[PDB]
Design a protein around this ligand. Structure first.
Ligand code: GTP
Ligand code: CL
Ligand code: CL
Ligand code: CL
Ligand code: CL
Ligand code: CL
Ligand code: CL
Ligand code: CL
Ligand code: MG
Lengths: 209, 121, 1017
């Protein structure tokens, strides 16, 4: 199993950590808890050329929490630059993040992602987004919330890193599940948790699913 | 999955309850499938996420389990599971599963129970 | 553990330990990696860590440790450099320079430590920004000299120069004062003759070395700013366009250089420079044809294969061709000897436009728009491009993406479903494709029609039948509506509809009929002109839409309803009238058939259907017939409403029934839907339900409150309460919808307003936070917006009910109750505009909370809130000023002027509210200009804190000097004094004022900023 270092950069609040957490656990984190320096998370995808592992270096976007800053970029083999289509400032900062990034990583595949395209009042419109053209970056509109194009950045990078343009994600194998008998020595806490779970409302009851 | 029969397929969103955080966290959206192993006649829930196709549910539909309503929803079930192997080593979870419709949720409950009767034999 | 020792600075730095911490961080994993991270971050942030840098650079075995030592120095150089005494600055300069030199002269280090060397060069450039040329006048000459004796040092000096150009010209605008950017630009400009000479020599004397590549990379940055004579009056153009295009080592960078050259500022009058602009293009295209690929090459397949750098090369070729041709193609259009070159270049773009890659396709499509727009207006040009345009018609017709209206899509399993999400990117791409194809159709309507008709023929016979191909064709057919003559359109549209209806009957299964149905619906919805003239077809179209409303695919049903809306908003007149050959107006037969037309529609589709009927009914201008047509439309909802009003007032126990709330919700949604399209004409129908609707609002409100009491807050999440609240929200939506479009404002004030306010205001005020509907505030905003001026007491009442209680919900944090937050400041905005008197009648303590609420809004990063907060401040200041010299305004300025000034300064300067800079600046300008123009009649100072005669001007300066001195103690009194002097003189000149604010924001991030920078303007 070959692994690749991925660095994720962009302004604070653009959705970098949310995007990564969606891919790690399936969840949608609604709160904004600013990253401090960097959080490193392994992320594997199964493909028709075997598993590919990304070591995702999810960096801080707030200057005051920047930590090592460009120090995080050393030996990155790919990157994602993130901005927020509801915040023009975050797009105007894309050339700055790109500059800092390519000075350390001169020849890596890079995806530019405009996040939050689910929001109706969009400020950075499709026709304004052209910075990727001269810099040879792939671009995708994404949303961590609706999951629109959420797999594309990793899929494109995997194709570039492996050097195979017909690479596809594939259904991971499904091992037969066990038949674990319930043990009353932790039943009380298991049914304490169940009744609490029943009386906690599910989030986003107005969604389609 | 190719020595298993698809007894039932439905589009759904799966949650797990985080006890420390006290909040429901989404785990995956996609086709929830009931798969009956043709050799053992044992029916499992298998569910994969859209696009990545990563497993978000993989457990036997145990006879002991009971689907229960969630206070917020007419189109969801909550139940305890003692051994799911989606993310690898067997863990226990309190799952919730939401469907697009109350009729889908009712249909799911019928099928979940029929699969339970099958697993008793 | 052991790793934390490097943070103890009392001891000497264990260098080997640092290197273990660094390699644990970079090469480790898990808890150890994250532990090392936190330690390394603390080490770097220690304000004395730079003193250890020299030591790390000399003694460490780990290149990453040295990188981090330079990061520490970088931070010191850019932020605190000017506090250091000369000896330290010169010292740090010396060991950075010395290290770079010694790294370059060891040939193994030069190969293997590229990251470290580039980082040292950047660090050197940061020193240059502080020191050069005023305290380092010899740098460029000494750089030029040291390049001659070592090719590694020469190559590395191209990198230093590249970085220097970038920092001075490309990234100076945000990071330096205007004065300092101007000073460094002037400095680089004066020394450039010498820099270019070195650069030019290197390019002549070498083929495709790493030295050549680095030199060309430096040239790319110089081309952003250098005078054009360096490109056109030397041999550089010939070298770029021939020699450096042949070698694949230099090709990519050269091609980017040539793209920038195609944007240099040039003479328009000079025939020789035009010949040189032509020649470099001729040369480049020649090298491409003979060294890389011929004009006929399948670039689609080449790009798909993704060998080496082919994708990046084809992207760069696209950028070069489009950049050059958009500026210079007229140079190739007249001379017959340049025709082949013009057309081959465009033929390359045709081939590039077939590539399967959306972003590249958008890039070439932008150029095609530029071309075809020019050919549409420029005389005697279109004939040149006839064969190119013909090929382009094919490319676009075959690569049309899905328009917004088409609700059926092909998923991954291979099935047809309703679309989950709107694709805003593909919608925009559809529109860009439409613009080009519309232009192309005008340029040759015969060619376009022939292409489309023969493609349709090969969908009939099945020789090219597919979902993709019927779709792209149908979308293209729809996109060109308005390009053909009425007669040509008649025969065309009838032909395609007939042929598509034939396909809809032939093909098997429910997937194929959903596809063809969506295509039929898209086409007919795009050609309203045709349908208006041909009632026969219009009627059949509509009853076909009604037929699609019975299909089992919900997407087909949804699209029928939207297509019905779309046709109806253009053809409504042809429904309102009784046409020839007809027993009745088609409106009236639609209305009586509603029950059975909409039987298999789900509620949301039914509401759209009713809204469409509303559009039709509003075409009828005779008041009597419209009011009746409205009555006829609403009978099914009014009968359900009339039988449900009697049961729920005969016993309030029946509204418990969850099935009953669903019917009530849908009755009000139907009224909302119709009121949306009818506006002021809806009044009769509203007046029928209004009093009973508002009683139902109260009845529903009681049960929500009772359920919360009995069940707790968790009741607000239950299906039952959510259903009950849906009724309240929809009632509010209906009243808001009506009042927004209302044309009898006397009726609104006299009939609607008083019962609305009695029904909603105290219910909102007296519910617990989680039970309050934000839609109440939204509703009141429209009420104040439209009739606020007619109900001064009603507005006072609105404030009293919602102001303090809503503020209390939203002033603990920035996150909680997001929709209340947004609707709250929208409400206060409109009250402050339209009925400012209401705020004059607030008691002094409540007015103080108004000011607190406004300043609270400034501090939001939520732009819905932020923008309204700053607008309110600006309108408020303007309202106060209009009152003149009276006690309220005099009191306002003494209590709140400096509060507004310092709160505006806080958000300007804290780096966490950059999105509102322009509005913040405008507000600050207004406040300062009030004092500068003496529009504040009273002293802002307290009596006996300054001399008696002293003006508000003098006091304003002292207050602000003091405020800034304490908030930014690292600024000198002089910096502060010059900043405020400049800011006060520039308070009528927004763009300059903003520049001075920007300069200040740079200076607060460093020590030792020059006070004379503020004299820039
Ligand atoms: N509507 C919407 N919200 C999103 C989306 N992605 C993220 N968010 C929200 O925006 C905020 C972004 O949070 P983070 O992911 O922590 O931001 P970040 O880029 O990691 O910020 P730093 O760690 O400070 O650099 C959170 O409140 C998310 O819930 C999206 O696609 N749509
Ligand atoms: Cl914005
Ligand atoms: Cl959207
Ligand atoms: Cl390094
Ligand atoms: Cl010259
Ligand atoms: Cl009309
Ligand atoms: Cl001073
Ligand atoms: Cl500072
Ligand atoms: Mg983060």
């Amino acid at each position: 199993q070959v692994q690749f270092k991925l660095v994720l950069v962009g302004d604070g609040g653009t959705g970098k950590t949310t995007f990564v957490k969606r891919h790690l656990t399936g969840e949608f984190e609604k709160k904004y808890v600013a990253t401090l320096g960097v959080e490193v998370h392994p992320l594997v995808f199964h493909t028709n050329r075997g598993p590919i592992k990304f070591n995702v270096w999810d960096t801080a976007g707030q200057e005051k929490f920047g930590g090592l800053r460009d120090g995080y970029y050393i030996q990155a083999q790919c990157a994602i630059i993130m901005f927020d289509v509801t915040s023009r400032v975050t797009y105007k900062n894309v050339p700055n993040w790109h500059r800092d990034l390519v000075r350390v990583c001169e020849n890596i595949p890079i995806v530019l992602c405009g996040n939050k395209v689910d929001i109706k009042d969009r400020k950075v419109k499709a026709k304004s987004i052209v910075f990727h053209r001269k810099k040879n970056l792939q671009y995708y509109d994404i949303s961590a919330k609706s999951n629109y194009n959420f797999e594309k950045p990793f899929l494109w990078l995997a194709r570039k890193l492996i050097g195979d343009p017909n690479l596809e994600f594939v259904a991971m194998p499904a091992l037969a599940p066990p038949e674990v008998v319930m043990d009353p020595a932790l039943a009380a806490q298991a049914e304490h948790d169940l009744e609490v779970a029943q009386t906690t409302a599910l989030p986003d009851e107005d969604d389609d699913l | 999955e190719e020595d298993e029969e698809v007894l039932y397929k439905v589009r759904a969103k799966l949650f797990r309850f985080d006890a420390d955080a006290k909040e429901w966290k989404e785990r995956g959206t996609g086709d929830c499938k009931f798969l009956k192993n043709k050799k053992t006649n044992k029916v499992r829930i298998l569910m994969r996420r859209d696009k990545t196709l990563k497993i978000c549910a993989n457990h036997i539909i145990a006879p002991e389990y009971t689907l229960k309503p969630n206070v917020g929803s007419d189109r969801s079930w909550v139940y305890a599971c003692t051994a799911d192997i989606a993310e690898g080593e067997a863990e226990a979870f309190t799952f919730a599963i939401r469907f697009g419709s109350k009729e889908n949720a009712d249909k799911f409950k019928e099928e979940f129970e029929k699969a339970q009767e099958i697993n008793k034999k | 553990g052991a790793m934390e020792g490097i943070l103890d600075f009392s001891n000497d730095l264990d260098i080997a330990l640092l290197d273990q911490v660094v390699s644990t961080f970079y090469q480790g994993s898990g808890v150890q990696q994250k532990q090392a991270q936190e330690i390394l971050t603390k080490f770097q942030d220690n304000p004395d860590a730079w003193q250890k840098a020299d030591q790390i650079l000399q003694f460490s075995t780990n290149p990453q440790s040295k990188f981090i030592a330079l990061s520490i120095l970088d931070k010191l150089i850019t932020r605190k450099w000017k506090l250091l005494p000369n000896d330290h600055r010169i010292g740090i300069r010396n060991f950075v320079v010395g290290m770079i030199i010694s790294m370059c002269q060891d040939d193994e280090v030069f190969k293997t430590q590229k990251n470290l060397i580039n980082k040292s060069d950047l660090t050197l450039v940061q020193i240059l920004k502080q020191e050069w040329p005023q305290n380092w006048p010899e740098f460029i000459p000494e750089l030029i000299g040291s390049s001659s004796s070592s090719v590694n040092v020469c190559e590395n000096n191209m990198i230093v120069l590249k970085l220097l150009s970038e920092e001075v010209f490309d990234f100076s605008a945000e990071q330096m004062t205007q004065a300092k950017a101007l000073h460094l630009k002037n400095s680089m400009s004066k020394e450039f003759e010498q820099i270019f000479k070195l650069c030019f020599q290197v390019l002549e004397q070498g083929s495709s070395s790493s030295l050549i590549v680095a030199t060309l990379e430096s040239l790319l940055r110089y081309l952003h700013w250098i005078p054009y004579r360096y490109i056109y009056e030397t041999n550089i153009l010939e070298l770029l366009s021939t020699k450096f295009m042949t070698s694949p080592d230099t090709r990519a960078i050269t091609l980017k250089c040539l793209t920038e050259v195609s944007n240099l500022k040039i003479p328009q009058d000079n025939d020789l420079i035009k010949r040189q602009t032509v020649l470099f293009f001729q040369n480049t295209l020649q090298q491409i044809a003979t060294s890389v690929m011929p004009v006929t090459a399948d670039l689609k397949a080449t790009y798909a294969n993704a060998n080496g750098n082919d994708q990046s090369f084809l992207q760069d070729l696209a950028m070069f061709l489009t950049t050059y041709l958009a500026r210079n193609r007229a140079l190739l259009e007249s001379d017959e000897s340049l025709r082949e070159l013009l057309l081959n270049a465009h033929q390359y773009l045709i081939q590039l436009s077939k590539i399967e890659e959306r972003e590249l396709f958008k890039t070439t499509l932008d150029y095609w728009h530029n071309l075809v727009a020019d050919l549409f207006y420029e005389p005697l040009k279109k004939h040149i491009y006839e064969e190119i345009c013909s090929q382009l018609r094919l490319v676009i017709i075959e690569n049309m993406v899905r328009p917004e209206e088409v609700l059926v899509v092909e998923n991954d399993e291979g099935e047809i479903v309703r679309e989950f999400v709107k694709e805003s990117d593909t919608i925009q791409l559809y529109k860009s494709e439409r613009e080009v194809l519309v232009y192309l159709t005008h340029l040759n309507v015969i060619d376009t029609e022939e292409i489309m008709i023969s493609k349709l023929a090969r969908q009939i016979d099945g020789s090219e039948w597919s979902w993709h191909n019927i779709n792209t064709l149908s979308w293209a057919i729809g996109s060109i509506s308005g390009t053909m003559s009425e007669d040509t359109e008649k025969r065309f549209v009838v032909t395609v509809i007939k042929d598509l209806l034939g396909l809809c009957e032939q093909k098997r299964g429910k997937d194929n009929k959903a596809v063809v149905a969506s295509d039929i619906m898209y086409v007919v919805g795009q050609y309203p002109r045709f349908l208006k003239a041909h009632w026969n077809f219009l009627r059949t179209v509509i009853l076909k839409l009604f037929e699609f409303m019975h299909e089992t695919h919900e997407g087909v049903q949804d699209m029928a309803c939207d297509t019905f809306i779309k046709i109806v908003q253009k053809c409504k007149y042809h429904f309102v009238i009784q046409q020839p050959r007809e027993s009745e107006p088609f409106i009236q037969t639609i209305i009586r058939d509603i029950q059975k037309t909409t039987a298999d529609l789900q509620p949301q589709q039914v509401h759209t259907f009713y809204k469409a009927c509303g559009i039709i009914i509003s075409e009828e201008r005779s008041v009597a017939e419209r009011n009746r047509l409205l009555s006829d439309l609403m009978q099914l909802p009014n009968m359900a409403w009339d039988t449900i009003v009697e049961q729920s007032t005969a016993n309030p126990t029946l509204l418990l029934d969850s099935e009953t709330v669903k019917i009530i919700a849908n009755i009000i949604k139907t009224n909302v839907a119709v009121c949306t399209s009818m506006g002021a004409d809806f009044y009769p129908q509203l007046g029928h339900i209004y009093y009973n609707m508002l009683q139902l609002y109260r009845a529903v409100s009681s049960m929500i409150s009772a359920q919360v009491a009995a069940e707790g807050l968790i009741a607000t999440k239950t299906p039952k309460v959510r259903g009950l609240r849906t009724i309240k929200k929809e009632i509010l939506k209906l009243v808001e919808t009506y009042i927004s479009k209302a044309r009898n404002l006397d009726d609104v004030v006299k009939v609607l307003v008083e019962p609305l306010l009695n029904a909603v205001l105290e219910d909102y005020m007296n519910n617990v936070p989680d039970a309050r509907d934000a839609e109440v505030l939204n509703c009141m905003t429209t009420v104040v917006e439209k009739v606020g001026h007619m109900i001064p007491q009603g507005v006072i009442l609105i404030l009293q009910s919602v102001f303090e209680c809503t503020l209390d919900m939203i002033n603990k944090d920035f996150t909680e109750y997001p929709e209340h937050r947004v609707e709250f400041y929208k409400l206060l905005k409109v009250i402050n505009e339209k009925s400012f008197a209401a705020f004059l009648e607030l008691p002094p303590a409540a007015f103080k909370l108004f000011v607190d609420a406004i300043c609270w809004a400034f501090k939001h990063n939520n732009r819905d809130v932020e923008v309204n907060g700053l607008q309110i401040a600006l309108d408020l200041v303007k309202n106060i000023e209009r009152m003149g010299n009276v006690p309220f305004a005099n009191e306002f300025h003494k209590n709140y002027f400096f509060i507004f000034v310092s709160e505006t300064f806080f958000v300007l300067t804290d780096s966490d509210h950059k999105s509102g800079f322009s509005k913040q600046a405008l507000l600050l300008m207004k406040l300062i200009s009030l004092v500068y123009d003496n529009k504040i009649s009273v002293p802002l100072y307290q009596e006996a804190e300054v001399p008696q005669g002293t003006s508000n001007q003098v006091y304003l300066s002292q207050y602000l000097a003091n405020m800034l001195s304490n908030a930014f103690p690292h600024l000198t009194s002089e910096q502060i004094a010059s900043f405020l002097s400049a800011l006060t003189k520039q308070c009528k000149d927004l763009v300059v004022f903003k520049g001075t604010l920007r300069d200040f924001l740079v200076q607060i991030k460093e020590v030792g900023g020059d006070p004379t920078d503020y004299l820039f303007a």
